[PDB]
Design a protein around this ligand. Structure first.
Ligand code: X69
Length: 294
């Protein structure tokens, strides 16, 4: 391109086409995301530009925001693999617990950092978690959602996964809190453990009902105010809560305990990233080297 050279198409993300590219001048290899539609609000430019300062070892660095030719390009540090591909590659044997624990610990540090800076992700999923050969894992796309209101779809009729969406979002709550990210990470934690998505909904109501069938239909006792949420319906079926030991076997009680706190219905009772880091589950955390085949 003007200063780059497409090495290939890394994919077709939630916002647009993503290319692995090499800077012709510096020689650095980066991920280039071309954002979708015919104006690009200046509000989004200032918002995104702010994220260039959000630097942490567990957050994918946003190197540049280029608004030229009236188009929007986001330049990110490049990592060779995402957690979704890695979990598929580890499907037969499963990701070893020490590595699951290291990944969860690093992700929580990343969230604690973003959340302490009043930045929410809002759309965490295995595909947005990038890993390298040194055992590091990083959150990609933090803050883009807010700087772009609602996602809906990618840019080429692609189906948005609802699997990691917190219940308050599904019940129509208009204001997101840091708690939505904890929920998504809890779903991801469970998926790494069992090797199966925790709530693989295929519609918004199927998503909600899958959650209800496992954690029990929420009520005013466990979630004060839930019955007044925008999309709550008194006609929701009432399902009994399932024993946690049946949800993520064979995770130990430290892990089940942390997961249950990351999955509390009430966003206000849900554990913060900071508090989660102090959970006994991380008492023996280490940083193993993964087996990446690139
Ligand atoms: C398409 O998604 C992405 C994937 C990425 N890497 C993981 C990867 C996956 C497949 C092949 N090669 C690398 C990166 C990045 N920052 O390195 C960015 C985006 N993105 O959305 O900006």
């Amino acid at each position: 391109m003007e200063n780059f050279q497409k090495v290939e198409k890394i994919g077709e993300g939630t916002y647009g086409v993503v290319y692995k590219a090499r800077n012709k001048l510096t020689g650095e290899v980066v991920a280039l995301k071309k954002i979708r539609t015919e104006g690009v609000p200046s509000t989004a430019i200032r918002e995104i530009s702010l994220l260039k300062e959000l630097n942490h070892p567990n957050i994918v660095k946003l190197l540049d925001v280029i608004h030229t030719e009236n188009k929007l390009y986001l330049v990110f540090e490049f990592l060779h693999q995402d957690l979704k591909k890695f979990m598929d590659a580890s499907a037969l044997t499963g990701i070893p617990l020490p590595l699951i624990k290291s990944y969860l610990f690093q992700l929580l540090q990343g969230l604690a950092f973003c959340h302490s800076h009043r930045v929410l992700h809002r759309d965490l999923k295995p595909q947005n978690l990038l890993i390298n050969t040194e055992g590091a894992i990083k959150l990609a796309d933090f803050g883009l959602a807010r700087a772009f209101g609602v996602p809906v779809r990618t840019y080429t009729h692609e189906v948005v996964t609802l699997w990691y969406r917190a219940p308050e979002i599904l019940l129509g709550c208009k204001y997101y809190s840091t708690a939505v990210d904890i929920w998504s990470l809890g779903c991801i934690f469970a998926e790494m453990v069992t090797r199966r998505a925790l709530f693989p909904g295929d519609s918004e109501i199927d998503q909600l009902f899958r959650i209800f069938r496992t954690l029990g239909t929420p009520d005013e006792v466990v979630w004060p105010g839930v019955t007044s949420m925008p999309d709550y319906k008194p006609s929701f079926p009432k399902w009994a809560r399932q024993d946690f030991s049946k949800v993520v076997p064979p995770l130990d009680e430290d892990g089940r305990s942390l997961l249950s706190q990351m999955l509390h219905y009430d966003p206000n009772k849900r554990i913060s990233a900071k508090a989660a880091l102090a959970h006994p589950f991380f008492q023996d955390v280490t940083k193993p080297v993964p087996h990446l085949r690139l």
